[PDB]
Amino acid sequence: EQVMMRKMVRDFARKEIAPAAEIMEKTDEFPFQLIKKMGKHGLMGIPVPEQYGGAGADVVSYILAIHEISRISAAVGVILSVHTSVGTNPILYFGNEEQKMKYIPNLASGDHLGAFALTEPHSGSDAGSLRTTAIKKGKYLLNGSKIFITNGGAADIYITFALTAPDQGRHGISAFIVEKNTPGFTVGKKERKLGLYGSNTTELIFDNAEVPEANLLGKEGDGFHIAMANLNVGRIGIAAQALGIAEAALEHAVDYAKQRVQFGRPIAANQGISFKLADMATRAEAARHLVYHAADLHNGLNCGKEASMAKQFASDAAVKALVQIYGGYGYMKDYPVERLLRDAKVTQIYEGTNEIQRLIISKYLLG
Amino acid sequence: QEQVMMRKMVRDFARKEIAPAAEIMEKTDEFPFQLIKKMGKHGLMIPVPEQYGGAGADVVSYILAIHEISRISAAVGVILSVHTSVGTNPILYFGNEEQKMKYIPNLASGDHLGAFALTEPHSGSDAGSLRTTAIKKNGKYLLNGSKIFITNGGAADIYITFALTAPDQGRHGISAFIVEKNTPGFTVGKKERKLGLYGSNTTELIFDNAEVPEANLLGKEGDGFHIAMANLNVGRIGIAAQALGIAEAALEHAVDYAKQRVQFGRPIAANQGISFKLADMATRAEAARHLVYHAADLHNRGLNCGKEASMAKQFASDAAVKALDAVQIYGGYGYMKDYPVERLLRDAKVTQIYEGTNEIQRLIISKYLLGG
Amino acid sequence: MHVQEQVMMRKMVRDFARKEIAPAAEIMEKTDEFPFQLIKKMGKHGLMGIPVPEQYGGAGADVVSYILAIHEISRISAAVGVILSVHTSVGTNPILYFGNEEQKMKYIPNLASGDHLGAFALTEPHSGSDAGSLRTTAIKKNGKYLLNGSKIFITNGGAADIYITFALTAPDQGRHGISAFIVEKNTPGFTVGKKERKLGLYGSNTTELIFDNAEVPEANLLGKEGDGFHIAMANLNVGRIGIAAQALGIAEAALEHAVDYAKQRVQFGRPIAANQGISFKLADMATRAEAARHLVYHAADLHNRLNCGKEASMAKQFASDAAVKALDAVQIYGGYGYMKDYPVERLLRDAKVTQIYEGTNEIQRLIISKYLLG
Amino acid sequence: VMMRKMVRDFARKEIAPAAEIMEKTDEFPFQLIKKMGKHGLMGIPVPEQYGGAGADVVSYILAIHEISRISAAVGVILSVHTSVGTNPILYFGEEQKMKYIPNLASGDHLGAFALTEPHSGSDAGSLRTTAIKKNGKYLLNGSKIFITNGGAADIYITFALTAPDQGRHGISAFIVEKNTPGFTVGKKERKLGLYGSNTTELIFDNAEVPANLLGKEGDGFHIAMANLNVGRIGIAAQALGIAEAALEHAVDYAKQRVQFGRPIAANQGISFKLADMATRAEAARHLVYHAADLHNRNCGKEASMAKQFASDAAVKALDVQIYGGYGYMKDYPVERLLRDAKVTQIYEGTNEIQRLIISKYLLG
C-alpha cells in the first residue's frame, strides 16, 4: 500500500508537479490547474476513509506523499498538508456524521480546497489569546481578523477558531466550519513572502460574518483542543516538508558535486565539501526516522512530543542547506537551490515556531 | 577624529539618502544610478589620495564607510566596495603614474564606476585556471573569452580585467588589464537574476577580439594573479564589513521588535529562548567588529594582513547568515517582504560565497598555520 | 528500539545493570581497576554471548537484543559497555562468522559463558585510521605462525584470554595481504604492556601488546590467508552500532540526571528548569537522543535482517557527537557538575572517546560520503 | 612597556615542569607560587605604594593569558588571588591596604574569594552566611563552597549578611584571615580538572572577625560583582590560553602525523578545524584585550562577551580528536585542555548568566 503510494506520488510529482513548480516560482500564482489534477489522481484526501470519499489509506502513506511532493515543491507540499491535516481532518475527527458527509467528499476529491484560520495579528504563538468573536443568535455572528492564512482565496472551506465565551480565555474558544461564500467574510490581498512561491497566504476579514449554527465544529469551548490536536499531525507534515526540502538540497548538491571541476578535480574530492554532503545525508536519515516514527505512533497513540521533535529537527536540518556547494551559481534564481533556503526558513516558524516546540518538548520532560 | 567624523557623516548620508534608494532597489531591482552620482558629490567614491582626486583618507575610514552603508543596504555596500578595492585600487597600487592620473580622478569623484573581471564559467575558486586570452597584435592587446558574475556590470565604465598573456604558464601567465567600457568587441550580458543584493547589477562579459591598448596593461606581464589576490585581501575586509553591517541591522531590528511584540502577557524578549539569541547575535557582532577593524588597521600600517582578512570574511559572513534568528524573532512577520529582515538573510548568504568562498578562506588560513 | 521480543532482555539488563553494574561502576571510577568480579557475574547471568547461538554456548538471541543490552549497560557505565561490546562484536564474532566449525567449538563456549574474555588487536603505533598499513608480520615457520611487531590502545588488554589479531602474511599486498589470527593469552613471546592512563572509560583496561617471535598455531589462522582486512571491517560495522549504542546510553544518562537535578535545584526563587536557557538544552538533548535512538536500532535491524555499513557509520557519528554534547549536563549541575563525587563529569570524559575509536568521526563522514558519491 | 616576554620565558622554564607535577600529584604548587612571588608576578596591577609591580590591567591580563597557555590551574590561582583576593581590598578597603596588600602583592600571602554557598551560587544574592556584631567583633556563621585557593590561602575576601531582612542589599564584605578562631577549611575537592588548584569548602562556626569590615555595611554585593568583572576578563584570558595551547599542539601533531600516505593536516576534515580554532582564537583575543583596555581606561558587557566567547571557543578543543587515540591519553598534552576548558563556562558566572547580563544591556 505504502510502497505503491510512494512510487505513484514520485511519478506524478516528477511528471506533473515539476513543470507546475517552475511556473509557481516565476509567476507566484496558486497552481489551480495542478490541484485539480492532483484531485483526479486521488491525492487530496489520502488518510480520509472511503466512506467520505477519500483514498482510504493511512497516515504514513499520507505523510509519505507530502514528503515526496516536497522533494519537488515545498509550496505544493504545504498546500496539500494544510488542506488535509487542518482543513479536512478537524471535520473528520471532531465533526458530526452529517457534517462529515456534507463537507468531506468535496474536500477529499479536491473539488473543494481546505484552509485553517487560527492565527491573528495579536495571537500567533499564544493562540489562546485570539480575539475573533463568535456571538450566537441558529446563526453565529463572527467578528475580527485572521492573518497569514495558507490556501487563502483558493480555499472553499476555512476551519476557523473564534471566541464563544470571551471571559474564559483559551477555554472559551470554539471551532467553526466556514464556507468561502459567507456574507460578511472577506479575503485580503495575497501576501508577498520570502518563499513558498505559489502558496497563497492571506489575511481574512470577518465583518458580522454569518455562520450557520450547524457549522459549529462541536462542542462549544472545545476549539483550542481541536486546533492543537490536529496541529500535531500537521507538524509531522511540516517535518516531512522540511525533510523533502533537505533531500532535494542533498541530491542536487551531490550531482553538482561531482560534475563541477575546479583545481583539476571535482569539488566533491575535497573533504571541505564531501563532509557537508555526509552531514546532510546523516541528518536527513535522522530526520526521516523522527518523522515516520511520529506518524507511525499517530497511525492510537500519544504522538505529541515526537511530532514536536520531528518538526524542530527536520526544519533546522533543512535550513542547514545552505547553495554554498553550487557556489556563485547557487545564488542564482535560474538554479534550483536558492529556493530551498528561502522555502526552508518557513519550516522553523509556522505550525508552531521551534521556540514553541522546544518549550512543548521540555514540558514532557519536566513532567 | 577623522574617523569618528567619517562615521557620523556616512551614518547621516546613509539614512537620508541610501534608505529611500534601498527600498526602490528592493522593489525595482534597478542599479541606483542617481544615488551613486550623489555619493560621488559627497566624496564617498575614500582611501584614494587627494593627488589623484579622492578624499585622502585611510583604510579604516573607508572600511568604516562600507560598514555603515551596509547597515542600511548590503547591495550599495558591495557596489562601493568593489568599485574602490578592486575597481580602483589595482590601478592605484600597481598601475603607473600616467595611468593613475588618467583613470583614478573620474573613479574617485564617482563620475566613473569601477568593476573587477576575474571570474569565469570554468574558473572561480580556482581563479588560476582562467581561459580568457590576451594576445598582443599590432601594438594593441587582443582579448578573447568570457567573464561571469561581474558586480557593477553594465553600470561600470572601467573593468580591471584578468587574462592569459602566457597560456602555458597557468597561474603564472596571467596578466591584468585596465579595460574601458566603450572598447570595440567588448560586450556586457543581461542582468543576472539573483537571490539577493537586489540593486547590484551582476552580469556576464563577452570578449570578442576585444581591442585593449597596450598602455592599459596593468603592471608587468605575468603579475596579474598576484595583483588580483593582493587587492582581494582589502576587498575581503570590505566584504566582512558588509557582513558586519548586515548582522548589526538584523540585531537592532530584532531587539526593538522583541521588546514591543507581546505574546503570553509579556514581551517576547522576556523569554530566554529569544533574549539569548539576541545576546549571541550581539557577542558575535562584537567579535566580528574587532576582526574587521584590526585587519584593516594592519593593512593601514602597510603590514601583512592576508590571514586576518580571511578570518574576518569567514567570521562576519557566517555570523551574519546566523540572522536567520532575526527572521525567527519577527516570524511569521519576518517571512514577509514588507518587513525589513527577510532581505538580510537573502543578502547575508552571498557574503559566504564571493571574494573567496569560506571553504577557500579556511584553506588560506590553514596555509598560514601549517607554514612552512 | 521499536517495534519484539527483546522487551524481556531490556528489563533483565536494566535490573542487573542498576543492581550489580551500578556499585561496580563507582568502584571502577575510584580504583581504575578492571571489574573482574562483575564480568564473572555477567557471565553467569548470560550477558556475555548474547547474539551467539546456543549451539556454541551463548544466549541464542538476536542483534537488536544484544545492542539493546549494550545501550542499557551504557546508561549506567560506558566502560563496562565497551568491554562487553568489544568482547562480543570483535572478540568473539570474528570467530563465529569467519572461523571454522572446530574453532567455533573450541573457543566460543568459554567466550560466550564469560569464562573467557575477548579482545581485538588491530591498531598499531603507525596504523590506526589507516589500518591497512599495519606492520605486524606473521611468518609461517617450523610448525607454527611466527608473529612480530606491536599493537596499541587495546581494549580488554591483560584481562583478555583471546585476542583476535591482525598481521601481514603477505607484506607486498598491503591491505590485501593482511591475515587474521586467534591468539591465546598464554602464547610464548606474546606480552602485554602496562595499563594505559586515559581521560576516561575508567577502568576498561587499555594496553599495548608486544609480539616477539610470538608462536601462534597454524590451526588458529582465522579463515583464508589475505582475508583479514575484510574480516576486521565486516565486524567493525556491528562494533560501530555498539559504540553508537554506548554513546546513546551515555547521552540518556546525561539527560535523565540533568532533568532531575534541574527540577530540584532552586536559584532566584524558582527551579533552574523554569529558565528557557536551561529547559531548551534539555529538549535539545532529548530530541537528539530520539534521533540517535532510531539511527542505532534501524542500523541493528538492518544487520539483523542486509547491507548496514552506511547506517552504522551515521549512528556512530551522530550518537557520539550528540553525547559529547552533554557537557550541557555538566553545565546544568553548575559547579557541582565539575566534581568527581557527582555523576555527570564522567559522562563528558567518557563521551569524547566515542568520537575516536572504532573509526574516528572524520573516517565515518568519509565512509558515508563514499556511499553518496557512489 | 609591555613584556609578555618575561611571563612567556618564566612560564616555559618554571611553570611547565611544575604543571606536570600538578597533573600527576594534584598538589597545590606551593614552591612555584613562592618563586612567582620573587619574580614579581603576584601583585601586577597593584601599585608600588602597596608593594605592587605598579603595572596596568592589560599587562596583568596578558600575564594570565600567557600562564594559561602552559597551565590553566596556575592561571586561575593567580587570577583569583589578584582580581578577587587582593583587588577588593585595593579598591574598596588606607590602613587595610597597608596591612594586607604588600604580603599579597609579594606573594608571601595568598588570596581567596569566599562568595559561593551550597544554596547560593548564580543567585549570589541569596547567601545565608551571617555576620552578627557581638560586641565590636563580628561573629560569622555558615558555610562556603567551591573556594579556589582553599587551604593555601592566607586571606579570604568573604561575603556574609549583616542585615538578613534586606537580601542582596544586606550583604557585607569581610577581610578574613586564615588563623581566625572558629574558621575551618574543608577537604580538597577532587575535580574533573584544574589539577591541583585547591578547591575547598569553608566552615564558619562562630568565627571571630575583628576593623576587617571591607567598606560600609551593605556594600558587599556591589563589591563582589564590581571585581567579578575584571575577574571575568581573566577567566576569558584563561580560556584563551587554553585554546591557543590546543591549537599549537594540534598543528604540530597534525603536520607530523602521517596516515594514508599524507600528513593528517592535508585532509580538509582536519585542516578546517585548525583554521576555525585559529579564527575563533583571534576573535577571542580581541574581545579579551579590548575589555581589559576599557577597564584600564564601563566594561561590564564587554567582559561578559569575552568570558562567554573564549570559554565556549576553548571547550571547542574537543578538536583531542586530531591527536586521535593518543589524545585520549594522560601522557599526551591535550586531554587536560578539555577537562580544564569546561570549568571556564561555569565559574565567575556561568555562560547562561553571561548571556543574561549581555541581553540586559541590549534590552535596556
Ligand SMILES: Cc1cc2nc3c(=O)[nH]c(=O)nc-3n(C[C@H](O)[C@H](O)[C@H](O)COP(=O)(O)OP(=O)(O)OC[C@H]3O[C@@H](n4cnc5c(N)ncnc54)[C@H](O)[C@@H]3O)c2cc1C
Ligand atoms: C507562510 C505562512 C503560512 C502560515 N499559515 C498559517 C495557517 O495556515 N494557519 C495559522 O493558524 N497560522 C499560520 N501562520 C502563522 C504561524 O503559525 C505563526 O506566525 C507563528 O506561530 C508565530 O506567531 P507570530 O507570527 O505571531 O510571531 P510570534 O509568535 O510573536 O513569534 C515571534 C518569536 O517569538 C517566539 N516566541 C513567542 N512566544 C514564545 C515563548 N513563550 N517561548 C519562546 N519563544 C516564543 C518565537 O520563537 C518567535 O521567534 C503562517 C505563517 C506563515 C509565514
Ligand SMILES: Cc1cc2nc3c(=O)[nH]c(=O)nc-3n(C[C@H](O)[C@H](O)[C@H](O)COP(=O)(O)OP(=O)(O)OC[C@H]3O[C@@H](n4cnc5c(N)ncnc54)[C@H](O)[C@@H]3O)c2cc1C
Ligand atoms: C554577488 C556576487 C558578486 C560577484 N562579483 C564578482 C566580481 O566582481 N568579479 C568576479 O570575478 N567574480 C565575481 N563573482 C564570482 C565569485 O567570486 C565566485 O562565485 C567565487 O570565486 C566561486 O566561484 P564559483 O561560483 O564557481 O564556485 P566554485 O569555484 O565552482 O566552487 C563551488 C563550491 O566548491 C567549493 N570548492 C571548490 N574547490 C574547492 C577546494 N579545492 N577546496 C574546498 N572547496 C572547494 C567552493 O568553496 C564552493 O563551495 C561574484 C559572485 C557573486 C555571487
Ligand SMILES: Cc1cc2nc3c(=O)[nH]c(=O)nc-3n(C[C@H](O)[C@H](O)[C@H](O)COP(=O)(O)OP(=O)(O)OC[C@H]3O[C@@H](n4cnc5c(N)ncnc54)[C@H](O)[C@@H]3O)c2cc1C
Ligand atoms: C573550580 C571552581 C572554583 C571556584 N572558585 C570560586 C571562588 O574562588 N570564589 C567564589 O565565590 N566562587 C567560586 N566557585 C563557585 C562558582 O562561582 C559557582 O559554581 C557559580 O557561580 C554558580 O553556582 P552553582 O554551581 O550553584 O550553579 P547554580 O547557580 O546552581 O546554576 C546552575 C545552572 O543553572 C543555571 N541558572 C540558574 N539560574 C538561572 C537563570 N536565572 N537564568 C539562566 N540560567 C540560570 C546556570 O546557568 C547553570 O547552568 C568555584 C567553582 C568551581 C567549580
Ligand SMILES: Cc1cc2nc3c(=O)[nH]c(=O)nc-3n(C[C@H](O)[C@H](O)[C@H](O)COP(=O)(O)OP(=O)(O)OC[C@H]3O[C@@H](n4cnc5c(N)ncnc54)[C@H](O)[C@@H]3O)c2cc1C
Ligand atoms: C578507549 C580506546 C579503546 C580502543 N580500543 C581499541 C581496540 O579494541 N582495538 C583496536 O585495534 N584499537 C583500539 N583503539 C585504537 C583506536 O581505534 C585508534 O585510536 C583509532 O583507530 C584512530 O587512530 P589513531 O589513534 O592513530 O589516530 P589517527 O587515525 O592518526 O587520526 C588522528 C586524527 O586525524 C584524523 N585522520 C587521520 N587520517 C585521516 C584521513 N585520511 N581523513 C580524515 N581524517 C583523518 C582522525 O580522524 C583523527 O581525528 C582504541 C582507542 C581508544 C582511545
